[PDB]
Structures are given as structure tokens and as C-alpha cells.
Curated annotation (Swiss-Prot), chain A:
Record text on subunit structure and interactions: Component of the small ribosomal subunit. Mature ribosomes consist of a small (40S) and a large (60S) subunit. The 40S subunit contains about 32 different proteins and 1 molecule of RNA (18S). The 60S subunit contains 45 different proteins and 3 molecules of RNA (25S, 5.8S and 5S).
Any single biological process term in GO: translation
Protein name (record): Small ribosomal subunit protein uS17
Keywords: Cytoplasm, Ribonucleoprotein, Ribosomal protein
Species whose genome carries this gene: Candida albicans (strain SC5314 / ATCC MYA-2876)
Curated annotation (Swiss-Prot), chain D:
InterPro entries: KOW (IPR005824), Rib_uL2_dom2 (IPR014722), Ribosomal_eS4 (IPR000876), Ribosomal_eS4_C (IPR032277), Ribosomal_eS4_central_region (IPR013845), Ribosomal_eS4_central_sf (IPR038237), Ribosomal_eS4_KOW (IPR041982), Ribosomal_eS4_N (IPR013843)
Gene: RPS42
Any single Gene Ontology cellular-component annotation: cytosolic small ribosomal subunit
Organism: Candida albicans (strain SC5314 / ATCC MYA-2876) (Yeast)
Stored CDD domains: KOW_RPS4, S4
Protein location: Cytoplasm
Protein name: Small ribosomal subunit protein eS4
Amino acid sequence: LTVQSERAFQKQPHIFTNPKAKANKKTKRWYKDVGLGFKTPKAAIEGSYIDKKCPFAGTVSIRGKILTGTVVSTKMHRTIIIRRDYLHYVPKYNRYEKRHKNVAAHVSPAFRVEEGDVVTVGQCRPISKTVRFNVLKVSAG
Amino acid sequence: GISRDSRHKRSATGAKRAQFRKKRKFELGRQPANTKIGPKRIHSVRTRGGNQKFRALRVETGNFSWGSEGVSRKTRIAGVVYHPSNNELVRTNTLTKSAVVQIDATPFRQWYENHYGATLGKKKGGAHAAHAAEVADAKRSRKVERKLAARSGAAAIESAVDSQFGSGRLYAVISSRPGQSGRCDGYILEGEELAFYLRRLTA
Amino acid sequence: MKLNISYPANGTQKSIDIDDEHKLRVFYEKRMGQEVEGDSVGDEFKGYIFKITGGNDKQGFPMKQGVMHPTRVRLLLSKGHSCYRPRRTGERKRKSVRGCIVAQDLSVLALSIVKQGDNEIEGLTDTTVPKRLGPKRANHIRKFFGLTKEDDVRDFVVRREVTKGDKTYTKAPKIQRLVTPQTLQRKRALKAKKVKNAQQQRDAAAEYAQLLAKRLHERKEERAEI
Amino acid sequence: ARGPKKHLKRLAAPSHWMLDKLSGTYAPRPSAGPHKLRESLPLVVFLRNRLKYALNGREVKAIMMQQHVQVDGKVRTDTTYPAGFMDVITLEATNEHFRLVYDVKGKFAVHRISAEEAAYKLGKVKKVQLGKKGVPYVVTHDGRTIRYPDPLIRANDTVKIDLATGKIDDFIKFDTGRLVMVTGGRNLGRVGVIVHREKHEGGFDLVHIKDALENTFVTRLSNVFVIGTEAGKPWVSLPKGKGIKLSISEERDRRRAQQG
RNA sequence: AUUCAUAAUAACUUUUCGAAUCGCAUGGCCUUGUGCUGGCGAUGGUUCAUUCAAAUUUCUGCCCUAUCAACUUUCGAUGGUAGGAUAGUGGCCUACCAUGGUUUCAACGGGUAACGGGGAAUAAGGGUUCGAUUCCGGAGAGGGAGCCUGAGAAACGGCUACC
RNA sequence: GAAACUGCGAAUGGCUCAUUAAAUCAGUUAUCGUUUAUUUGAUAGUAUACUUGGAUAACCGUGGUAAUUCUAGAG
């Protein structure tokens, strides 16, 4: 799973590692705290993957809605779709009907996701045609 | 004209959408600049808000940065050697962001020779070694000798960058957006980024 | 075709109706801007040389510079083009214009006299018309009379005479860009305002520095107590 | 649709203006300025419907063209100027000064003030950051920016602005026990004291408040306005009613006490 | 919550702008020179803030129909990297790559004598039906499409072309 | 105080409901994803000058077309 697997060199923008200062010959890595009580995963701080869409080692911020759901597909590259089950109330019959929504969310390499897992996603800016959410917490299922 | 609306696309379910309105001016697009290397030719575009962009049609020179030395010079673009998006851009010498170019190494050579009092290239050429030896010992005062002596130690550069200076052409990557800002600026490739692009170039 | 012949040097104009086609055959295949000799055109025009300056065809559509045609074309005209005066900002119209190449289909051919050859003309070469207005900007007046940058321009201003019953009087153009005590007063005032503003800004920054220093040192001793 | 709106339908006008239903199709559209369109009070409304000085809008323009009207010490010729909270209105020719302050009813009551109090105004601090050349500034709730503010002034604090010079006299810290006035929501206009500020990161901050009559009522932090250091001591004059809410029975009893 | 505000270094630019503008009054200083000075305003102009606004945008909620069960991906469909374009995000478009995306919890398709809502009538309760139309939002100016100008329009009591 | 040059407005309003079925819209969000005339606040001493040019309209005059809110020479 080599980092440099593209036509262009993968780098974090404007994080300059000087090849001349002195030793500690490893590239400096930037990361942030997303806030709202979410911890930065260890793979984000000591990792080596480059992901501009990562909430922790990337330029996207988390703001707006916080959602949770069950992962139903991990067949895209760095993107998952999660299922949100809920119950719709029909007043005339004083009852409920089962409904669901599929939401596409970016998954950072800092996490590990498999189908059948519950994840918490935070809302970011549009980062794809269908993606507006980004994984912040993975619960094994 | 060119439109950036998303309503003309299919749904995420694959459904065909129906037209909801006519095309709006606030969702337009324009033609690409397709900047080439040549005598300067910059056109102005009036944009939203009465603002103004500059479309570089042709540019000769650019502002390029030596990151590990903290100095930037206005040098000459020699050509395009690599483009991650499309090799046709290399073939036609189209300057966009992220294109890998060769620039003239002359101004950087003057700066380094004046600053550290040494030479770059390691080419003991017939007439090259004459220049190298002359640069080694020139007409130079004493306080300046001492400041250069203190500046040594931080005077050797990495071998991969050094070996290029014997050609006068340094590898670089464009960082500006020539079709938008009208300028073609960049930085000298060094380190593992330089190693990666050299590996790609040798193919 | 008629010949709208004008004489810029004296500002005389008059039209001449030449119904004979063979006379005005030296005009054919010529362009606006090009100059011609009038030996072939008529007999009184001997030695004259005219510049072709435009005209209108049998349907009244004007001649336009740059249209390389003896025929009518249809053009999208905008602000600045001749043969079109825009009615709204940014408005363009598509209009019919006549080409710049002179042919036999022209109702008139505008001409300007370039040189007067041997004889005179009935109402063009033998008369003159005065200019309508004199200079109004100060340095235009100075260059009109060769005046140096010391003479009071106010006392050489052309003054047309207006009569009303018997109380005849003079009308004089107001002069622009003329230096008065008021203009120098304004030039003084702007600089005075800039300098005063800079002074007040420096005072405000100095006061902020003093406040910062007071807080800094009282903080030093306040945390030195603990 | 193609650009900004310039008319205001009468039924779309804010409900605190007390506009009649049938006077016409339109209502004065407040101009762009220091206060929000919905939370302002255009001067034509204040001088026609409230003071009753002018009989109609054309008289409002006749009055204001003669320099009579001032807001915050400056003559305004705008018939629709967006006067808002704390704004000082001065009528020199009648030698009369006003401050727009909400009443407990939720309206900009007509409040006569003295000339000495008509020389400043309070302002809620919205943000502080450095500008060009490293200079810090604060922004008040009326779009006023003041350079070089006190290093301790933070958001939601209130500064006492001197109208003649636009400079900060003194400020009040936001903390428990502060005399405040509610500037939005259901509790518009009611004056209380801070009891507990409840924090919700990413969401909304709630502020528990208490009246002089011990009734506790909670409000969004955005609707709070610090008006005094402690209970009973504001820095501005209060409307007739002291910002105290009465039940419908209580107001009926007081009306029948002063009219029967 | 940030690579934010801000500051610094090295340079860069078909070098942005740091007032060749106007009206009233005209006072003050004596080293009296057509000297120096200076009051109230008009119109300007850089950046930030603010206001009036736009543009995209999260969540959930629509009538009938299976005599519509599979749909989307040729010619973007779902996602990744780089670029171009835009005021800006985004398959918005391009190049390369992966094979994804929706669906009996009704997708997709078809119909609507469908603009949506605030609301209206009836009304024990639960419900049933209406809402083109005084307010709010959207869309259009015979039908399409393309544009100039402008802060703002794909404007039609604006232009261009075709029917 | 006409004309005309310059500036601003003419993108508001008013009309209608054809298109439109996750579209519009409603209530809730977001811009740490942007543009913003105008208003209101701030905001710039930067490393020939007692003040630069030369057009052009209005105006005069010569006019062409059956005809248009067409306009052309020339001063």
C-alpha cells in the first residue's frame, strides 16, 4: 500500500521538509484536532498516507450535522456508503413504517472499516458529487 | 455557453432529471487558456463582481523558488518534461499547474556563487574548469572572505540537485495557475519529490 | 452621382450634381482615403486633387471604412463603429452598410479638396467661413496665441457679441484648469488633512503601546507576588 | 431574482412597527446601514407613526431635509435610515432626545432621555481580531469598528461608546450576576440578571436569567445584551416599565386601578 | 476545529492606487510677498468590517400508477489522483485509474384535467376535500439557443440567430 | 435655463402558472466553500506642479434613402 501510487507526487501542501538542516531524516507531517470531542487517531499523527480529504491530516473541516449509521459497502476507494434506518410516523394510523437512507461518506486511511460496522460521520464541504460526510469514529460490529 | 450546473447530470440513483430553468450566468464556465512557452501574451477577463483574471496565452519567464535556500529568482522556462494529468500537455509544451519543467539555472548559479563562494556542477570541462577555477579565487576583500567562511558548512547542496547544474537547466514544478493569475511560477524540485520525478522521467 | 465636395481649409461646403457617368469614371475602383486628380472629372476641376471620404448609395446606406466591397454588407455594430449610435449601454445592432470601394451604384460621393490647381470654384475656393468657437482650456488659449507661462490668459479670451434690442454685450467662455486662490486652497487642504491624519494615527499607536507596557509590567509584578 | 429587492409589502413588514393593514400596499423598506432590516426602525416610522409629528411621508422628507433629525450625533437625510437598538435620536429644533430601547412588550418604545445621557450609547461586542498593520479592533452590534480596544474586551462584552469621538469610555465583562436585556426571541425587552451560562460546543449557548421578581427564563446567548454591572444599576435609562413582565390578569388589574 | 486573523523573508507583475475634481464663505500671521497659512461641505478611492443581497448547501417530509422490476455505466454512471474552468466547492469538465451507484423499506419508468407553502370548507374525536389567486419562495415573457453591458440579468417595455 | 457629454437607475415593480414529482417548496442546517453596487464604521506621510495632453458630442453647414428613435462627409 505504497503512498506514491499516482502520476503526481503525493504531498501535504505547504508542509516543507528541508533536506539540508540536519538529521531526523523523516518528512514532517501536519495534522489537526477536529474538535467536538473527537480524538485524532494514532494513524493520523504517526502515519504516512497522504489524504487531502482526511479530517485530521487533510484540508477539510468538520461542521454542521453529525450522523451515525451502519456501513453497507466498502467497495469504493476511500469512500463508503452507510445505511440510516429510522421510523416514519403516520398520524392517521397512529403507527410507524420502516424507512432508510443511504449516505456516501469519505473514509480516511487512518480508520479501518468493514461492512457491518457502525460509524459516526461529520459534515464537510462537498468533496464529491454525492459525498458530504466524513468518517470520524469506527465501532466494530 | 459552458455551464457548471449539476442539474444536467443524472441522479445518484441513475435517474434522468428534467430541465428546471434556462442556463444562468452565475453558473458559467469559460475556455481553457492552454498556456504555451513563447513571447508574452496575457489577456484580461472580466469576471463576476467586476473582478479581473489574466489568461496567460504565452509566457517566457517565471518566478521560481529555491526552497532549501530561501531565495527566488525570475528565470526562463525551457520546456515541459512531465505532466501528471496528460502527456499530450508535455508533447505540446502546455504550461499548467503541477507541470514539471526545466528552467535556466543561471540566476541561481550567480546567487550561490556570490553567497557561498563556490561552484556547482562538478564538470571539469575544457572551458568549464577555467570558470570554476577562476570562481574559486577572485578579487575579494577580507571581511567578505570571513562572512563567506562562516557561510560555509551550510554550503553543500544535495547531489541530485548539484548534478543538474552542469547543464544550466534545473527541474521545477509550476505552482501558480497560469490561466487564472496570468503568471507561471514554481519551485525547484528537491528531495524525495525530485527523486520521484526523476524515476518517472527515466521510465 | 452628386459630389458632396468640401474644403476644410476655409470650411466651405457645396454639392455638385454631375449627371455624366464618363466624367466620374476616375472615381471608380478607388477607396475612401485614396486621392484622385480632377482633370478627367469635368472641366472646372482641372488641377484639383480630391480625397474620397465616403458617401451614400442609391438606397441611402453610408459607406464605411474597412469594408472591402463595392456592395452592401451586413455588420454587427457596437460602440465606436461609424454608421451606428448606440441607444443603450452595451447595445449592438446588425445594420446594412456600403463598402469603402467606390462604384457606379452610389447616389453621392463625398469629396474633400486636397490642393487647388489652377482655377477657383463658385462657393468653395473663393470664400471662407469662420470657426464657431475659440479656445476654452487655458493652455489651448496659450498655444493659440503663443502666450508664455506668465501672461494673464483672462484678458485674451475670445468674446462673441450678443445683441438684444439695444443692450448689446459679450459672452466669454469660462476657462478650465485655471489656477486661482481656491484651487491652491484645496491643494493645501488635502495635504494638511493627510498630515494631520498621520499625526493622530501615530498618537493612537503610541497610546496603545503605553497601555500595553503598563499592563505588561503590572502583570510582571502581579505574577511576581504569587 | 436578477438582483436586490427595493420594495417592501406592508404585510411583510416587521410586526413590531405597528403598521395598520389598510393604509396602502407598501411599507417603508429600511435602507442598508448599521442594523438589520428586520431588527431596525426606519426613521419615517419613528417620526410619523410614533411621535405623530409628521402627517405623511412627504412631511417626513420636509422635516429631514432641514437638518432637524440626528442619529448618534449625526444628521441623516435618509427618510428610511435603519435606526436600531441603543440608537440615540435627537431633535434639536424641539430640543428633544430619544433612545430606541425595547419595551417588555417587544416594541421600540418612545423613550425621552436627557441631553447628558444623549451623549453616548452601549454596544455589544461581536468579535475582535487584528486588522491591517497588526492593529486589533472590535465590532459592535451596530457595525461600528473601534481600533485599539482594551486588551481585555472579548465577545459578548458591552462597551460604552462616546458619540462625539466614537471612542470607548468603559466596558462591562460578561459573567454571572450581570444586568442584561434580551434583544431577541419570546423574551424580547425583559431585563434580568445572569444566573448561569450553559455551553454547547458547535451548537447554541443558553443563558439562564432572572427578573427582579424571581422568575427564571432562559434565552440564547445571541439574544443577550449586557446593560449594567449589577442588579438595579444599568448604564442607560430604562423604558417606563423597568423591563418587567406582567401576567394578563396583572395588567388588567393595573389598568382598572388607574382607570377605575 | 484550521495551513484562521496577523506578522516576516526572498522575489514577481503588459504595476492596481496612496485626489491634475466641485460649491459656499473667505478669516489669521506679519519677515507685506498677488507670500505663508485655513472653515463648512460635494464628489471620489485601497483594504477590512457591516448592511442590502446572491450562489451553492445538511436533515426530514410530496398525488396516482406493477397492464412500469430492475435501473445507471456506448457519449460521467459511483469513487480516486492531477489539472482546467468558476466568484467559489463539486464529474462542473478533461486525462489516467478502479468497478462502482440506486432498488419490493418500491428504484427506474408512465400519468397528473401538479408551481409549492402560509392557508380554506366541513368539522365529537379520528378524518375528507380545496388552495391559479391580496403574503412568502420558484419559473417564464410566442418557441428554443447564444450573449453585450453592468455590483447584480443568460434581462426580452436589451441585443444576435433560427423556427 | 433647452440640447448634448458624463453619472445613476432601467436586474425593483407589475403580470402569469406553461414547465416542474426529491425538482419546486416547508421547517431546520452550512459556507473553516464563495461574490457582493449601495448604506454605515474604520482605513493610506513611502523611500509642468501656482496644476499635462488631444480628441469628441451638442452647435454651424453640405447631404443620401420611399421608409426607421438611420445617419454620412466637413468645420
